[PDB]
Amino acid sequence: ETLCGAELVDALQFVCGDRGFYFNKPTGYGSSTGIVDECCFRSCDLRRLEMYCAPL
Numbered sequence: 001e002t003l004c005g006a007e008l009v010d011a012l013q014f015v016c017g018d019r020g021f022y023f024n025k026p027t028g029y030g031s032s033t034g035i036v037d038e039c040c041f042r043s044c045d046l047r048r049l050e051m052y053c054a055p056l
């Protein structure tokens, strides 16, 4: 059981609330896949899903 398309967006809107979400985690400067790969093509748990919520 995975989350794809609208189901995936519904889950993110519910879990992230008003924070917003991204499909790929930004890399940021001086740093040393995405949610579709982790949660739609593959099954992911709530903890991993919430990691795609933007910051407060």
Ligand SMILES: C[C@H](CCC(=O)N(CCCNC(=O)[C@H](O)[C@@H](O)[C@H](O)[C@H](O)CO)CCCNC(=O)[C@H](O)[C@@H](O)[C@H](O)[C@H](O)CO)[C@H]1CC[C@H]2[C@@H]3CC[C@@H]4C[C@H](O)CC[C@]4(C)[C@H]3C[C@H](O)[C@]12C
Binding pocket: 001, 002, 003, 010, 011, 012, 014, 015, 043, 044, 045, 046, 049
């Ligand atoms: C279904 C959950 C999201 C929310 C959701 O999915 N809905 C909204 C629920 C409550 N919503 C609100 O509080 C809103 O304000 C609405 O009620 C409000 O009415 C509208 O915003 C107005 O635009 C879906 C609700 C479906 N909607 C309806 O049925 C109708 O809108 C209905 O209620 C009529 O409005 C009403 O009859 C009129 O009188 C998502 C969030 C996280 C997800 C789990 C993540 C971890 C695991 C991943 C696996 O790969 C699969 C397993 C899983 C356990 C996932 C399961 C599931 O995928 C979850 C529980």
Ligand SMILES: [Br-]
Binding pocket: 022, 023, 024, 025
């Ligand atoms: Br993104």
